[PDB]
Design a protein around this ligand. Structure first.
Ligand SMILES: *[C@@H]1O[C@H](CO[C@H]2O[C@@H](C)[C@@H](O)[C@@H](O)[C@@H]2O)[C@@H](O[C@@H]2O[C@H](CO)[C@@H](O)[C@H](O[C@@H]3O[C@H](CO)[C@@H](O)[C@H](O)[C@@H]3O)[C@H]2NC(C)=O)[C@H](O)[C@H]1NC(C)=O
Ligand SMILES: *[C@@H]1O[C@H](CO)[C@@H](O[C@@H]2O[C@H](CO)[C@@H](O[C@@H]3O[C@H](CO)[C@@H](O)[C@H](O)[C@@H]3O)[C@H](O)[C@H]2NC(C)=O)[C@H](O)[C@H]1NC(C)=O
Ligand SMILES: *[C@@H]1O[C@H](CO)[C@@H](O[C@@H]2O[C@H](CO)[C@@H](O)[C@H](O)[C@H]2NC(C)=O)[C@H](O)[C@H]1NC(C)=O
Ligand SMILES: *[C@@H]1O[C@H](CO)[C@@H](O)[C@H](O)[C@H]1NC(C)=O
Ligand SMILES: *[C@@H]1O[C@H](CO)[C@@H](O)[C@H](O)[C@H]1NC(C)=O
Length: 497
């Protein structure tokens, strides 16, 4: 069961696409979309993978081979998949699943020759063959003959089952004949349905690596698995807070969470755990609260609460085991985040800001007390000012306010307009993150806001639209780089400013 995701060895992925009369032209188009995502996902784990693209009907057509160096290049693979045409199998309309699997075998036999039989370069390659089909084989003989042949050239045993996986997926179909080819057989309708199931086809537990911004993309997975960087913080307060793993023992949070003293020996960090229901709890070795933070710094000006430099770093007393439940999030302007973005090597922090925050309204997220993922729109450029200006109506926090720039600076990101969710106080410190090509990036850090949904309060989350009005400001990590560098330069490899 499952394809293995690990730094060890190599993965040869072979995507076989049905093109017979059985499959309509609209059906093959959704195979194309389903094969793209598979390629996109398998390249998002930063592992050594090669993708072969084959279409088959009466005979197989190889569009990408693992013998080609381009099979290790995401762009090239997908282009040879975008250029795939249904009419290419009009002159042969049958279903010859044997010949198509034999193609893969002829490719494996060729790759043996290239690298060497006795070589590590061959025997470390794990093989996964995915057939986007419905079954209904009608020529070429039994597909079993080819599967046996692949087993023989790969030496498959009970101690070597990890080296061969055959899947047969129906999208848009014979049930038990797919189990013949392959539970390694699935019947699916939507492409978004396959996106879910492909998540379950992958085994990541053996990726104890410190890779950032990797999560589980499917429901049926726990909230902790989808947002594995998310931690819960307890200070000397009972007042709950949130934060984010940015490495194996550093967590990024809000400074306003520790408004009772800097003695950290009474604080707890709660990390996700694969065995535990409640997660592993960690003690703190040392804290780094921004020297510039001071809630009552603007008290004499009238401003009761000022959240400038609202940022803090906690070093845990022990390393966190990287797992399906606990991984660091990608922090922008690092080499870590750079590889995640598939960027070139000469990238700067300025490049990263432009890539990630690209529109004037950017859809981001933050995680609720619930644990589930919530949606927000970061307002940039000219939209930022009209987003920020609304703070001029709050007079419970700011009585003698004339200048908005005094409380809200470009140091803050702005969200909370229209149908945005507003974070609660317990959710502050939590990460404000984006998803790009299946990877997760923290652009921000929940700090303050004009309305608290949980301040109902009793147990609920209410908005209300005659209050003047709800709006939320997060610390902008891009504006916070010299500090992050100052303290994390051993932990992360930062890029030029
Ligand atoms: C499926 O077959 C078609 C048709 O080809 C059939 O032609 C019959 C007369 C007979 O010879 C059969 O044995 C043969 O399967 C094929 O589509 C094109 O067919 C036409 C006319 O026969 C060809 O001209 C054309 O090949 C090229 O056409 C270009 C455009 O005019 C010319 O510039 C060039 O010189 C060359 O003649 C065939 N193919 C193309 C490229 O359009 C079709 O290709 C084939 N499907 C498959 C499997 O690709
Ligand atoms: C997304 O999350 C799901 C979990 O909801 C992951 O699927 C799970 O994968 C694990 C790891 O293999 C399975 O747990 C165990 O596997 C071992 C294999 O040795 C087995 O011995 C145990 O009996 C146990 O099954 C788990 O079954 C499986 N869960 C389901 C319901 O499929 C999935 O891997 C994640 N996907 C990604 C891309 O991270
Ligand atoms: C976790 O909290 C979220 C947000 O409060 C819940 O999402 C809401 O669920 C209710 C009931 O189904 C809906 O009326 C709202 O439309 C949802 N809000 C949105 C837009 O996300 C979520 O149900 C909670 N999870 C659980 C079941 O504890
Ligand atoms: C992946 O490629 C690297 C260099 O590109 C190579 O040294 C190594 O054998 C492969 N496996 C990994 C992920 O180390
Ligand atoms: C996850 O949920 C989906 C949709 O409800 C369900 O079909 C499936 O059984 C679950 N897990 C998988 C993909 O096996």
């Amino acid at each position: 069961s499952k394809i293995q995701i690990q730094r060890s060895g190599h993965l040869n992925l072979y995507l076989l696409l049905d093109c017979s009369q059985s499959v309509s032209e609209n059906d093959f188009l959704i195979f194309k979309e389903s094969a793209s995502l598979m390629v996109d996902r398998i390249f998002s784990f930063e592992i050594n993978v090669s993708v072969a693209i084959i279409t088959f009907a009466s005979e197989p057509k190889v569009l990408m081979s693992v013998l080609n160096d381009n099979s290790r290049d995401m762009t090239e693979v997908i282009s040879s998949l975008e250029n795939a045409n249904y009419k290419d199998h009009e002159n042969g309309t049958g279903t010859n699943t044997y010949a198509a699997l034999n193609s893969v075998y002829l490719m494996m036999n060729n790759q043996m020759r290239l690298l060497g039989m006795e070589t590590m370069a061959w025997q470390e390659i794990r093989h996964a063959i995915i057939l986007l089909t419905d079954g209904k084989s009608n020529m070429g003989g039994s597909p079993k003959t080819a599967v046996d042949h692949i087993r023989e050239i790969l030496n498959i045993n009970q101690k070597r089952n990890d080296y061969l996986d055959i899947y047969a997926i129906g999208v848009g179909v014979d049930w038990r004949e797919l189990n013949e080819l392959g539970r390694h057989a699935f019947i699916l309708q939507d492409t978004k349905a396959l996106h879910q199931v492909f998540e379950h086809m992958l085994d990541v537990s053996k990726l104890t690596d410190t890779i950032c911004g990797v999560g589980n993309m499917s429901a049926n997975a726990s909230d902790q698995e989808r947002t594995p960087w998310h931690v819960t913080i307890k200070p000397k307060s009972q007042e709950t807070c949130r934060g984010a793993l940015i490495s194996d023992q550093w967590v990024l949070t809000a400074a306003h969470c520790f408004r009772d003293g800097n003695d950290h020996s009474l604080w707890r960090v709660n990390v996700g755990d694969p065995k535990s229901q409640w997660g592993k709890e960690f003690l703190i070795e040392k804290a780094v609260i921004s020297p510039g933070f001071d809630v009552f710094a603007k008290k004499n000006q009238g401003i009761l609460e000022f959240y400038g430099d609202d940022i803090a770093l906690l070093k845990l007393a022990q390393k966190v085991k990287m797992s399906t439940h606990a991984r660091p999030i990608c922090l922008p302007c690092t080499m870590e985040a750079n590889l995640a973005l598939r960027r070139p090597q000469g990238s700067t922090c300025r490049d990263h800001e432009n890539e990630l925050l690209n529109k004037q309204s950017v859809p981001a997220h933050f995680v609720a007390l619930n644990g589930s993922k919530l949606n927000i729109n970061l307002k940039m450029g000219v939209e930022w000012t009209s987003c920020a200006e609304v703070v001029s109506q709050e007079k419970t926090m700011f009585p003698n306010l004339t200048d908005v720039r005094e409380v809200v600076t470009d140091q803050f990101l702005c969200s909370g307009t229209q149908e945005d969710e507003s974070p609660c106080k317990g959710e502050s410190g939590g990460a404000v993150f984006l998803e790009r090509r299946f990877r997760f990036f923290q652009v921000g850090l929940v700090s303050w806001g004009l309305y608290n949904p949980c301040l109902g309060s009793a147990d609920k989350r209410a908005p209300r639209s005659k209050v003047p009005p709800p709006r939320d400001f997060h610390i902008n990590l891009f504006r916070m780089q010299p500090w992050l560098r100052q303290h994390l330069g051993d932990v992360l490899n930062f890029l030029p400013l």
